[model samples]
Target: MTLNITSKQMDITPAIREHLEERLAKLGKWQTQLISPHFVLNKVPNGFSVEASIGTPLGNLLASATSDDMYKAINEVEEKLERQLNKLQHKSESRRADERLKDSFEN
Candidate 1:
C-alpha cells in the first residue's frame, strides 16, 4: 500500500516518514487490503494527532489518535486500524461460511 501523509502546521521529516512507513509494513496481510493508505498529522494546541484513513475491501478503515509525540500518535492510530482490520476479516469469513452452509442445505 502507498502511504500518503499530510501534516497541519507542521513539516514531516524523513525520520517521521520512515517511522510511520516501518510500522505500516508490519501490517502483514492487512497491508494488501489497504488502498492508498493516507495519514494526516496535526499539531494540536495541547498535543499531536495522527489519523489513518483508507479504502479497504469491507469498507473505509478510519482511525485517529493523539499523543505528546508524533511517533506515539502514529503507533496508536495504526493499532486502532489493526483492530478494525481484524474484525473485518473475521466478519467477512463468517459471512462466507454462512453462505456455504446455506448452499449445502438447499442442494
Candidate 2:
C-alpha cells in the first residue's frame, strides 16, 4: 500500500499520485513497511498546500510545503522528509558515544 491522499479540491489526478509516490518512495528505502502514510493536498484561498506524514518504528515523520507549482510543492515537501529520514538514520550510530571517554560521569 502506498499513501492515502486527501484533497480539499477534488482535483486528485493520477499524475499527482505518481509524483507523490515518487517523492515518498525515498522513505521506502529507509523502512520496509510504512504505516498509515497520509498525503494532503489542499488549495486554500490563495495557495497550494502539500503535506505528508509517515509512520516509523521510532516515531512519526511529518512534512509540509507550499508552492505556486504543484510539482514544486511535492518537491519541497519531499525534501524536508529526506533530511528528516537522514537525521533519523544517524541517531543510533556514534563512535564518539564511548562511555570510556569520560568527560564527567557525575556531572
Candidate 3:
C-alpha cells in the first residue's frame, strides 16, 4: 500500500510524515487494496484541512477533516476513514450472508 502525501502552502515536516505513516498502518487490518492512497493537506484560513482517498475492496473511500491544528485534522480524518472501512466490511459480510441463504433455499 503506497501513500502519497501532499501539502499545500505549507511544508510537510518529517515528524508529521512519520506520524501519518504509523496511523495509516492501522488500515491493514481491513485487508483493503488501498490502491495508492493519497492524502492532501491544506492550510486554510481558520486552521488545517486534511483529505484522504483510497480504493477499497468494495469501492473508493473518501474522507476529510478540518481542525485548528494539523495533527488534529489528520487524526480526525483517520478516524473517519476507519469508521467508513468498518462499515464497508460489515455491509459486505451481510451481503455474503444473504447470498448464502438464498443459495441454500434454491438447493
Candidate 4:
C-alpha cells in the first residue's frame, strides 16, 4: 500500500511534511488490509482541516477532522481514520468468520 499527502493553501515544508508523514506512519500498526489512502489538507480561515480517502476493490473509506493547529488537525483526522479503518477491519473479519461457518455447515 502507498500513502500520498497533499496540502492546500499551505506549503509542504520539510519539517511539517516530515511531521505529517511520521504521524501517519502509525497506520501500519493496524491491519494491512486497508488500501493506500490519499490525504488532503485544507487551510481555512478558522484553522486547518484534513481529509483522507482510502479506496478498495469493494468501496472507499474516508474521514475528516479540523483543528486550530495544523499538526493537531492532521492528528485528529488520523485518529478518525484509524477508528474507521479498525471498524472496517472488524466488520470484514466478522463476515469472513460467518463465511467460514457457512462453508463448514454446507459441507
Evaluated with lDDT, which candidate comes out highest? Answer: 3
In order, candidate lDDTs are 0.74, 0.73, 0.76, 0.68
TM-scores for all predictions? 0.77, 0.73, 0.79, 0.72
- Which ranges in model 2 have alpha carbons more than 4 Å from their true place? 92-107
By TM-score, the candidates rank as 3, 1, 2, 4
Compared with the true structure, what per-residue lDDT tens digits does model 2 show for residues 1-107? Answer: 57778876846788888777766676687743566777887665566788888777656777898877778888787887776767665565655864344565576
Candidate 1 lDDT tens digits, 9-50? 687778867766775667645634676777777778778887
User: How far out, in Å, is residue 86 in model 4?
Assistant: 0.8
**Candidate 4 Cα outliers beyond 4 Å, as residue runs:** 56-59, 92-97, 101-107
- Give the TM-score (vs. native) of candidate 3: 0.79
**Pairs that clash in candidate 2:** none
Q: Write the per-residue lDDT of candidate 3 for residues 1-107, one digit (tens) a residue.
A: 76677776676677767766776676766747787777776778888888877778777777899889888888888888888887776676555546564444455
Q: What's the C-alpha lDDT at position 78 in model 4?
A: 76
Better structure of 3 and 4 per TM-score:
3
Indicate whether candidate 1 or candidate 2 has the larger TM-score.
Answer: 1
User: Any idea what lDDT model 4 has?
Assistant: 0.68
Q: List where candidate 3 sits over 4 angstroms from the true fold.
A: 92-97, 101-107
Full ranking by lDDT: 3, 1, 2, 4
